[PDB]
């Protein structure tokens, strides 16, 4: 499941559109990465499958606030 654990980012659908303007179905899909975040609050490496951006959001909101979600959302981590 290509899905960013922090921002729900799955892949999306769209056309390709040539010069001749030809529709062709395709997908846009997230820049995911799965990264080993250090928590300290837990003395452990929780390692989420995260899309860059999701990254930017951890870097802002804070891992403790992000893992706060999920926990509160049902997710594993």
């Amino acid at each position: 499941s290509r899905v960013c654990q922090v921002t729900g980012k799955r892949p999306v659908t769209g056309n390709n559109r040539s010069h001749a303007l030809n529709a062709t179905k395709r997908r846009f899909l997230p820049n995911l990465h799965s990264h080993r975040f250090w928590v300290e609050s837990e003395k452990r490496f929780v390692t989420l499958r995260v899309s860059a951006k999701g990254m930017r959001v951890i870097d802002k909101k804070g891992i403790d606030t992000v893992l706060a979600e999920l926990r509160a959302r049902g997710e594993k981590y």
Partner: peptide, 19 residues
């Protein structure tokens, strides 16, 4: 640089987000 931080500085006690 973001990397240096989330990969070294922080989670390794040396810095903190300017929150």
């Amino acid at each position: 640089k973001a990397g240096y931080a989330r990969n070294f500085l922080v989670p390794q006690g040396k810095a903190v987000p300017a929150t």
